[PDB]
Amino acid sequence: ATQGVFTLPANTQFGVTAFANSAGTQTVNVQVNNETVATFTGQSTNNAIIGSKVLNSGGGGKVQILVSVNGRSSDLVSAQVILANELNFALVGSEDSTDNDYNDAVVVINWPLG
Amino acid sequence: ATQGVFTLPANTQFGVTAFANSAGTQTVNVQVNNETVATFTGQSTNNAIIGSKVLNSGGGGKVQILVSVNGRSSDLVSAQVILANELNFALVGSEDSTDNDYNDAVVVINWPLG
Amino acid sequence: ATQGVFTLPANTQFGVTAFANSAGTQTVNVQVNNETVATFTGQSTNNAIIGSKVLNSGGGGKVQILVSVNGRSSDLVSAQVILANELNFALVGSEDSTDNDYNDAVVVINWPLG
Amino acid sequence: ATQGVFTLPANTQFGVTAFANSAGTQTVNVQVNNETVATFTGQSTNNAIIGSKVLNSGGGGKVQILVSVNGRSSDLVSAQVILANELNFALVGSEDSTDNDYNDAVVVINWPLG
Ligand SMILES: CO[C@@H]1O[C@@H](C)[C@@H](O)[C@@H](O)[C@@H]1O
Ligand SMILES: CO[C@@H]1O[C@@H](C)[C@@H](O)[C@@H](O)[C@@H]1O
Ligand SMILES: CO[C@@H]1O[C@@H](C)[C@@H](O)[C@@H](O)[C@@H]1O
Ligand SMILES: CO[C@@H]1O[C@@H](C)[C@@H](O)[C@@H](O)[C@@H]1O
Ligand SMILES: [Ca+2]
Ligand SMILES: [Ca+2]
Ligand SMILES: [Ca+2]
Ligand SMILES: [Ca+2]
Ligand SMILES: [Ca+2]
Ligand SMILES: [Ca+2]
Ligand SMILES: [Ca+2]
Ligand SMILES: [Ca+2]
């Protein structure tokens, strides 16, 4: 199945934060309604934050996360969880190799903000 | 029900990251096996990161998040989600007032690292 | 926080299924747009299905689960999870006593159908 | 990523329930520590329950769900959600055709029981 794609409510501010846990340098691409709006590039084997930004979901609400290492697309896993029918988390893990820890880049999307 | 309490595998490193979205200064206490190991204090209405640390779950694996604003306990909501039977997110939201956005402090715990 | 309340897309068919794990007879009330549309009454200490029905979320999309045992409201826990940005689960546990297993009535809501 | 594989606590009773939403007849295979312990076969386009059993997780706690239609493996999506650090749901969807609704067989695993 496709992973890393989420439908947010329209015109909503959201946070996106990425962490790295790999020998490989991670590139996280964030798209909103099919346009790249953020890029995080970094490397850590100890969960360093490689980016955190506030974005708007726009008219369409479509948010897509892609992860690559040296140009190779990482395999993604994702889900959305809603707490108290209002607090949302869109969650991504990614795997750049074959150990299947799925933490090589970890991406957390959160809304609402403010 | 009690919220903000999670059982991690023993002696395992985990990331804890807190975000703020409130007029109130947030205090996030992180306890491992019933002892405070970290406290994050900060203020933001724009999802600023008020703390991010790597911690160890210790022998018992018990991790508890408590949130307060000027000595008043916030109401917590939480859940744990596991992707691909391997990547874990323990998620906390909190409410310090009456609008019920539950984002006033948001805490994300992730494991494994590395 | 309020638990057991979920916002579904309007005019959408959904499944609701309840399981019992308690000495006490469970009465699960399902409200759609603030009107009772199903009542499941049963008893089991071994996960018997006490109801499974197809319902419609109607104009407003509001679904609420309440559980009582001998007329006393059980404490609820809940969350929603979405897989592949499409497959939805709204999940409820309930506690009728002091052992905090939260499984005394378990309620699973799933959509879409068909 | 591999989907439909879950680690339960050892030697633990759990519920497994399968629902169908497809023109295709669903065959759901349940394995405990790499051996089949149940098979559910049925058809519905209205969320009928095609199986519900109580099973034991065995010494290793490994539970796997596989779904096929007329011998063809369905694509799976899955996650586990834990409420109140106690109440567990392991969730599977599956897709047998081209519409990507992932509901064609839906499997819910719940524990603890009792
Ligand atoms: C080469 O493998 C990459 O780096 C290692 C240090 C591990 O983090 C592994 O999960 C990652 O996929
Ligand atoms: C006074 O209320 C607090 O501050 C506001 C600016 C909002 O973030 C609200 O959610 C928060 O509870
Ligand atoms: C009296 O307590 C009720 O029945 C027992 C058999 C247990 O299922 C317990 O969780 C439940 O709350
Ligand atoms: C042929 O397609 C199968 O049957 C249809 C009635 C739908 O349920 C579709 O999701 C399913 O994959
Ligand atoms: Ca890896
Ligand atoms: Ca890694
Ligand atoms: Ca608030
Ligand atoms: Ca707020
Ligand atoms: Ca109980
Ligand atoms: Ca019980
Ligand atoms: Ca389908
Ligand atoms: Ca279908």
Author numbering:
A (entry chain B), B (entry chain A), C (entry chain C), D (entry chain D): 1 to 114
Task: Quote the authors verbatim.
Two extracellular carbohydrate-binding proteins, LecA (PA-IL) and LecB (PA-IIL), are virulence factors and necessary for adhesion and biofilm formation. LecA binds to d-galactose; LecB from the strain PAO1 shows high binding affinities for l-fucose and reduced binding to d-mannose and their glycoconjugates. The genes of both P. aeruginosa lectins lecA and lecB are part of the core genome25 and while LecA is highly conserved, LecB shows sequence variation in 15 amino acids in PA14 compared to PAO1. Despite high sequence variations, biophysical characterization uncovered that both variants possess very similar glycan binding preferences, although very surprisingly LecBPA14 generally displays 2- to 7-fold higher affinities.
Additionally, a direct contact of these hydroxy groups with D96, D99 and the C-terminal G114 of the neighboring monomer is observed. This latter variation in the CRD, S23A, allows additional van der Waals interactions between A23 and aglycones of the Ca2+-coordinated carbohydrate moiety. In contrast to LecBPAO1, the G97S variation in LecBPA14 offers an additional hydroxy group with hydrogen bonding potential in the CRD. In each of the three LecBPA14 complexes, the carbohydrate ligands establish one water-mediated hydrogen bond with S97. Therefore, both variations are likely to contribute to the increased affinity of LecBPA14 for its ligands compared to LecBPAO1.
